[model samples]
Target: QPEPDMITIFIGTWNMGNAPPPKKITSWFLSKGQGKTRDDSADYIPHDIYVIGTQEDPLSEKEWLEILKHSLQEITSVTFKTVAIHTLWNIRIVVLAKPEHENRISHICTDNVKTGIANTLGNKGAVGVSFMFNGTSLGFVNSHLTSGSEKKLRRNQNYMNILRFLALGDKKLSPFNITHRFTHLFWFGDLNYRVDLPTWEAETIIQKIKQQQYADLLSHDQLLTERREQKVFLHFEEEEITFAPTYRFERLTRDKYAYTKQKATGMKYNLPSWCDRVLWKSYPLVHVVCQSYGSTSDIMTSDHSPVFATFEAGVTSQFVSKNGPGTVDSQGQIEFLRCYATLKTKSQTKFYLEFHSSCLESFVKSQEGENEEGSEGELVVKFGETLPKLKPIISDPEYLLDQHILISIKSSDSDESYGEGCIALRLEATETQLPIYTPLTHHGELTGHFQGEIKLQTSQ
Candidate 1:
């Protein structure tokens, strides 16, 4: 069940041109615009979540993150943690959210795609992150595709792959597939998906930009038109472009694009276009409404301008699982607290999970082989797909898990095989199970008042 509460997310994507970000750059966070209410803008409080994506970042892996963290603090005093993921080059995506929201935020995952230099170099591709909050999942992808005015066979395919199966360099498992996992997704970057018009025709549109006539120009936008016809990113949406084209501007000033600077110096190849862009998809459960989208003209260091977008989401915690108390959570749930497998046995394992549901019989019902219920058919508990080995949620001290579920027994396969068994420790119909990560050793100690033993026997 989705709720009515909303979270404001501020997204910023900038191509750094191998240079440091502007010092004391707070205008992007503080600037209020047509879609934002005056009162909201005047408060100076930062948005609830800040998702910053950058390409060609000058700082090294470790150095850039530290600077970004401090930059986040400069904008908001609210206690937050920064999560950063990057690809081959300086292409990186960072997420900053309130620490208090950790419990509701689950399934945090990241992946990167390599679409440069034989599709192995970091010069191109995307970095993305996805997480669930209040039962609704959201994803963000920051990409830097090939730079060219003409179409290339592989460039568009690379973006499509990233939007679908962004490869996670660490694992052998599938990429952090975004097309299905998220209820809403935001993609931003210096896409370099240019216009089809020639140099002179493109220059004409740039001139009309001053008179606020961007309609015809926008219709010719590569990404915009591709999305409209389901030719690429079939489910995504590209909104109206209220700002001028964001690339090829002259360094240190706002008035120059390729043709402008080139026309003076006899440079004839570049077409002014909205290279830096932000687009999104709001799936069924999530309510993601875009407040505004535009580029920063004042930042003159990089040839490409920075693009920013603000979105308001109405989401809440509710799931189909939850049988009034003595039960396990159902699979495919969007918002239950997840546990990580900590200690592994040849056959036994420990899971760290949490309970946030309003239902009990405290969770889900059974299929033929699912958790067994009482004679009245009341729910006991359930199981889900085995989780992958995941990193700690918080970076400091390697905070692996927030809850624990340990299932251990002294019995091995001598009389009964132990590898295929499930464990349950239950409380009442409305309360919760106690969480104790204590080790259950060979001497035979169970985590809770242990009656939990469900297994498949050779008798079968």
Candidate 2:
């Protein structure tokens, strides 16, 4: 068994409320805005995964994609790749991973549910997606639940609804219930769980921010209370909301709560609440540690300020490799080599890959497999008559030689988008390879895609 690696993941949620991207957005994103930075995070380690959730933002997928990719590139040096992007009405959630970890990402699945009209409409709901990154399965859910005071039960129902709503799947690897399927999960959006205080009492508590009486106010928070005793979000954990309430601010201004409406009674509306938030759950297989969770101050483009959270997730898998091909980072043209492969019956299950050939001087000779055909350098694997040609996915020979790609035995013939497999198999002499691999089955859950490696017990 190989050692596992520690990867940092960043997931954030902001309710744009139909507002455009902010003017000082990049600085806000990095906590380097005008004047001095708030929220206390100064370090800038690049995240392995960046997931953003936006609700009520009137940005098109293309416009948001540009905002997600190029605009982010203009502000940072680290390169990021798109994992998946999902939008429901005015809400959108996008996932991005570092270019270095791109190949490790295999299958992606997304699911959206409309809890608007009786928990089944487009106006109010959730958009979520899951994926396999570095052999660890994770899911991100962006949702907009029922609003207003006393809707705590509705919000709780919404939470459970989304939890049992989707899956990432078995060998076909597609999509149903996310909480039960993915190893770890994160849910964020405009939950609209307001502080359960009398209108006047809430106003009085919020006014005590200067006195630093936030602890008193947070004690009555609906979400916090529900998580503690109401049987809602029972096992989910959230950081203490030490910051001031994140909602109902005056539009385009961070100082005042927005509301000019009132009776002659001087009872103006708009009670402060920590409406926008981020929360996460972890399965026993993976450990999730949340470092800091808070709402970004100063950037008050919308009536509601945007919030962000930082996390470091530890995935426990013996599948990590330090000296493998894809472990190193490079944006330059990768040198591809002619590599050969031999396949055997798996379910018999002892699989490993090796590359003993030198760069350009190697030819396919054969090593431990049932029946391997190696003429010169090309290796052709025939699974079934209807199946398409096979191709290498991991173009880096050093990786192919160093690591054993997992190929699940699917009961039927199947090929991925990159060809029969999603791997990038590159050899100098393209004619010598059919881009094919064996162990593809006529009836199983998976086939021809890297699954796991063999264990030596001791030595041969």
Candidate 3:
């Protein structure tokens, strides 16, 4: 039998603020008008799954859809279809899929539950839609529960309502047995609860959800311990792995927001926190990689940066039933050997380069006060200074031929003096690669501050 072809799926969640046109305009302005580029030059082409959040306005959605469609058209090799689910004034989920996989796409808006939860904020909360893949089903539900004014009782009730909804449609539930056949359930979006807080109430709620089988992608064993030690919430897996913070206050620097502020101080600190997350089911996920981009260094186009995940579908090598042994063809053998040879070559050519000791210091000094450095309210990076030079790297035959690179940058200093830098890896060509760069700039600032990162990791 022929080897099963690998399908690359791209999943991303971005809160493009309230205005879509301005976001597009800002995206184009940041890209210097070349905003519609595709990932055709790379070997691992992106699967047509483009999911975005907070595109609340109709005009903005229409404009962004047009821009995205037009830009996607530039890539002749791959075709894409888009799906947008807007929750009135609250949020929106936009999905882009391949033509062949279009049939597998699905969406559900959970506005009516036993506990009167409307999709809008003022009403009882609501759950977004669910999508189904081939053998695996994926559900995406975005929630923006009551913000600051939420009381403990209200919050618990809201969470319970959500749980009842998620745990709904099981075999036990009759009338409308909405069997959740999906292998993975991704509950992502701005959940007002802060995982870092020592409040047992919040943790208990999460524990209850875990009991139902949804694993918080952002919090692992190590991260849980780290959060306990710091008494504050910090996103990103390891210290070395820089994940951008999602929320920021307008009047303060990133450092001010890093700590928990007392009610006495009226000023709000604008640091990056991983309040937004991607939740998944425990069974099908063999390995999970989660990332946050567009929150460090003040280059934010929106209040929240984009978060994404890559899930490897399970593969079973053995068979139990009628077909005793799997059939193998000559073509399959040839392809397997070729893949092995390529892997071997890549393993041997790997090289590591560290940023010089002063690299961080120099980058920070360069970004201060400049438009490219960052603006007051943006959540993405500004790349105007680096794009002209980086474009050549994108087109470079030598760079493209030998290996693919994944780059990510984040802010490190509290003074906002040093913007976060990047870590790049030479990935094997077959891995799916997405390179997103945005420029951060203010009106008077000459240079724009760039933020954001690149992901090109492989999942076996």
Candidate 4:
């Protein structure tokens, strides 16, 4: 079997509460400001897949779309438009792709079915989107299960719904035939269930997946022990600095004592807990690289510091030519090719950074002025951010042929504004590319016209 190229997938979950007051304001700033920055960084690296959760009622689909587009543009050097909702006002899903690989994204599916389990009885949570890349497929389900007296039951029901969706629905019912292409399945979100000293009831769900052979990527016994120790250390150390905890306050609004008390009461838990997590099906095609549950400091963008994980897609191989196409001689060999052609270029050659975005109006206006006509036809910003600071010898013809461009914008910090971000692009002549640009929408408001280009370059 041909080896597959490595693809990195990033998964994150944040709870943006239910009402639009202080929590609303906090969600907006984080999703737009710091949230935008972090998402953009992921885009800068061109994460192949992105999944988000708990952007519930307080945050509208339009708002999430806008933030998603901006962040996606930073990664894939393209744009993401809008979200397809499977459950009205409850759940939403969006997909973003790099310009060159847009066509490769064949299908997207979402399942937000409510499991009529014993304890939890409603469909309040969401199952995000599933996307395909190359010959491999990936699925992301972002959920915020119920919390409180029934928190355990709710979490278990949600977990079962997810498993059934992956193991039964998509694997069985979906027309796309995920089993043929999807070698890995990723389940992540604000589970609201802690692995350490988990309640007896929650154990059933864990055992169920274990019986089915699904491995908990974040909890590998030793790692969980280390994490518990770190949490204890941080908790004690913080007492000397401030008595506040991570979960209670969205930010430092009230006195530390008040905030701590509020968090404890509101959460119904005595101690702070890392309720967020990521899970994956055990397989050779999947490997977790890193996971983080909290922000670096107390002043986090959101009350729940974002939880995230990175997974490396398995590798595979393909064929290529040393010289231009059709250069092979009658014997099916390049007659005059260098003998060292047997050696492959460094694996790094295949590593290309991606960027994505939707609203280019403000960005274009900032660069050339308000006059749309003056803006250089579509303003083909290249990926310049990924280039090395020092120049290097251009040994290969492909190296000399490569180009880098940066996609960026400038705007005011006003309500009627489009914030700026960056995206990197590598212009290649031989590839057939269709760039997907999903426009940015905010608070159910659609901003700017959605636009993108199809690049068809011919040899000069």
Candidate 5:
């Protein structure tokens, strides 16, 4: 049986509610001497990735980043580098990865969409970051939706607006739909979805949380109801809530719900709700197992407590083999493709070594040096009287095992023939790169023989 290549990730979301940063965030990051009880399900595993999303943050972005880095440094010797960070007013999202993973990550991009006041204000909206980790694509979105408890439909509409407008990747490349583009996608922040309970009813049920009766109260959660009906967050999956609600806590208070009364009338203004949350979606092949989901109750600097979850994500397609081509030194971490090929054809012929759009660094061009149409991921192959060294692109050699090259042979003397052949990195075991003699075919018939070597090259 085969197993997936997994990496641990710590994903967290918080709404500071304009509260200043605390003196020390030891509890939030789980430092060794936090004097706080850790989540029962968590076993203090060091994470490979940290995706922190926040809304209504009071500190400057610089201060925010410094505090996080400093706190993380206190806990582990494994250092992390920021992959991408984006902010839209008070809403912010930052992705951090281990320093060793720098070469494995690529196609880093960020984008945001504002849903406040006719889609112009940054007060309400989402910020996102997307990138390729190893060979799989991942995306994260931090958003603050409409807040009114009665405006559930408004939140639904806002989500749709973000989905339709938010685009990731470079501006020069084709727009990427975050929902469909990533192998694994995470959306988190102050979603502001409320508990579907009356003020008096919620006050009565708040005591039940002490008995660990989360299911009783969560039965009336608006987010759960909408998700069940497929109204919003359609395919996203959220882990079970085993902790108390994250929102409606009294600022700077310990385990106190904000149920203030008006002077004129004995009435509660706000109901306790799980406003902050983390949700994820992934392609079926990618496994995302959430190990723990809980909130940091000790850090009560704001009205909403910070919530976090640990995930073990794996891309099954690119697992390392125990016995493979080369050793650690020769089979380097970063892989690139080197092509050596010759073509014998009449009229104008075009050769394309196709790749994923994210892997493409530059657009493919024809022999005439003109940009080719529909050449986002195509590496144009030009062969004249002899085999020419084609400009190589960056990619994993194992990826080419399942890919092919498209050859279009066009001649006025005969009908246009299109030939296709699978790319073979090495036809045989040898030190030097040898041209693999592949028989090109059209409709199950041999068109010609392609002498080419699409060899994999590794770098330090």
Candidate 6:
């Protein structure tokens, strides 16, 4: 059979609970032949790329790096080298790859952001590494979000803060600036979203965990609930959970839950949650298939268990161009404008709107009280259809407002353009997320109206 176009990748996440790295972590990386029964190459599955993320780690960066390198050497004969490492306080993200594939990866960039107390501390935050591998762009994010069974909203806010501020590469492709620039994006770490069950019910479910009944427990997972509600992790995909929860575990113990002492009660275990998680999103051109998703039970040196996922991810064979059509970066910088409008005509005639980037000229001419009427380009949208978004590579955000959308009638017997008007990009408020109303006018007459708003966004 011909060789496959996809490459294997292994991603793992762990919350160390401020513990040092353990001496032996072979079982965490190598899933088979745990007892050293055989030395055959088939006994272990070696991935081409490995991405490791850790949170609440107490050791220094050098120590973690040494341990990871040592662990890889102990498990297999294949050579692996660190491609990049980025850390924000105790949170860390590391990328490793085989030496032979080094030349295929380029444009590596790293960044970090803090979302701890008051969004100024480093106790909680995210670190990221992005690069182009085999002609495909890939990004990895390692974050330690807010913890606490009752702080779900805080965790979601922390996620948004990272995506909004953690700029990566000279291109500064934050999800706010460019919309999903990377071909494949991986987000994994201690998310801290809990199981949304009461104390009594959670206790009962924890008891059920002994029988390995995970379906009931996962139904109440906070992350899944939030995704269903569209509160966070939008468009991201996660594999099915066939293992037990990874949080609030008894340190260095197997199949046990950790507990805290209370004055009124003898002992109470924190809600068993899947705080350590690995999730991914990919562009339409790329394909990613999850081969394995489970927690490492043997290496339990911390309060949270380590979670691992193995995937076969495809890469572009030919170099693919980046960015959307008509995207021009000013000084190598671009801004995404998310345009939303409720456009309607006075009559129920089938009409469409055309947005042009050249509206900047009209907006400027009109600003100087000059009458210049014309169209630049075409981004046509039929009435009652999805409004087309705008991405203009300009220095100022106001230049985006100067762009205009032309409203016209659907083709008919008459060639003369009638019932046609221009919608000047206008906003009642400059603050993001707040929308406003605007009037559509042409030839000194109001033809129709539209409620419009624009918010800057980027590729997360």
Which of the numbered candidates is closest to the native, going by highest lDDT? 5
After TM-score superposition, the amount by which residue 136's alpha carbon in candidate 4 deviates from its true location, in angstroms, is 0.4
lDDT of 1 at 258: 57
Q: In candidate 1, what residue range of length 10 has the lowest lDDT sum? A: 395-404
Model 2 lDDT per residue over 1-460, tens place: 3434667776777788787877555544553432223343444456678898988888898887777676457655766888898887887889988787777777788778777464446577888878876556788889888776757888877777666554443323221235434556788889888777777665576577546577777888888888777346544567666667777877777777653336631454457878888888664324577766766776777777777777778653323233223332221121212332333333332222222121111212122232244454323333322221222223343333322222222212231111111222232332232343323321211223322122111000
Better of 3 and 4 by lDDT: 4
Query: Model 6: how far is 322 from its true place, Å?
Result: 20
Number of clashes in every candidate structure? 18, 34, 36, 27, 0, 10
lDDT of 6 by residue, 204-223 (tens): 87787888787878899999
| Model 3 Cα lDDT, one tens digit per residue, 1-460 | 4221233333444444443433223221111111122223432344445454442234555665676566455543455676544453545555566676665544433332323335434433534555544323345555544433123235445544654454322222111112122334445555443333333334343443335322342353223443345321221122122343344323223222223344632443222335444444322212333322222233344555444443434312111222112321111100011000000011112111112111011111122211211134332223332321111112222222222112112232322211212222323342334333322211111122333333322222
Residue-wise C-alpha lDDT for candidate 1, range 1-460, written one tens digit per residue: 3343788887888888887767755555554332222244444566777888888888776776666666667767665676445555678888877776656676677888777465446478888887777556678889888776665335567776675457432121121235433456788888877665766575587777767787777778788777666456655676677877777777788776755435543443657777887878664334578876777756767877777788887665434323312443232122112222222233332222322122222322111122333445332223333222221112111111111122322222232211111222221211222332222222111122222222111100
> On lDDT, who's better, 5 or 6?
5
In angstroms, the error of model 6 at 121 is 3.1
In the order shown, the candidates' Cα RMSDs to the true structure are 14.5, 14.7, 22.5, 21.7, 12.6, 13.3
Give TM-scores for every candidate, taking all chains together and pairing residue i with residue i.
Answer: 0.64, 0.64, 0.44, 0.46, 0.66, 0.67
lDDT for model 6 comes to 0.63
Kindly provide the TM-score of model 3 when superposed on the true structure, using C-alpha atoms. 0.44
**What are the lDDT figures for the candidates, one per model?**
0.55, 0.57, 0.34, 0.37, 0.63, 0.63
In model 6, where is the ten-residue run with the lowest total lDDT?
Answer: 362-371
Residue 332, candidate 2: Cα error in Å is: 42
Q: Any runs in candidate 5 off by more than 4 Å, and if so which? A: 1-4, 31-45, 118-122, 170-176, 261-268, 316-460
RMSD over all Cα atoms, model 5: 12.6
> Which whole-number lDDT from 0 to 100 does residue 140 have in model 1?
86
Give the residue spans of candidate 2 off by over 4 A: 1-4, 31-44, 118-122, 169-176, 259-269, 316-460
